[PDB]
């Protein structure tokens, strides 16, 4: 149901990370680096 016109005009991008069960989350950082 995502708007095709919005998708075609937007510049916003997405990725996601699944921290697996049993992996301690405070030891995992997610984000961007230069």
């Amino acid at each position: 149901r995502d708007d095709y016109d919005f998708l075609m005009q937007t510049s916003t991008y997405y990725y996601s990370v699944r921290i697996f069960p049993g992996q301690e989350p405070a030891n995992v950082w997610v984000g961007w680096i230069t």
Binding site: P21, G22, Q23
Partner: protein
Amino acid sequence: NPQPVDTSNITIPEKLEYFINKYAEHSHDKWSMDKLANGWIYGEIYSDSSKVQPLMKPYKLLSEKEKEIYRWPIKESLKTMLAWGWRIERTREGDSMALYNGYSPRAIDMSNVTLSRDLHAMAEMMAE
């Protein structure tokens, strides 16, 4: 000749009742899992061939006697680890989640959880 550790004099704290909670639930969950894999269906009448079992009602809908025996091995486990003297301490997030607060069987997969080397040693002492 086996003489396992005595736990009759040992007593449990009231804090670990919350630990008994959700873990008797998880045990009932995995029991329902493998038995429904075998084909067991929620029929109040009890028949092996027909695979109708009155016990897949959730842990809440179980009766207290059926709540017993489920918690029993966990009770002896905690009483034993206390007889070993092992101090158990509960973190702040544990209190925060407690304050935060037809049957649908969902199983919690804990296989990928890994224990340390010493923790493995204590697990072996448990097993022995």
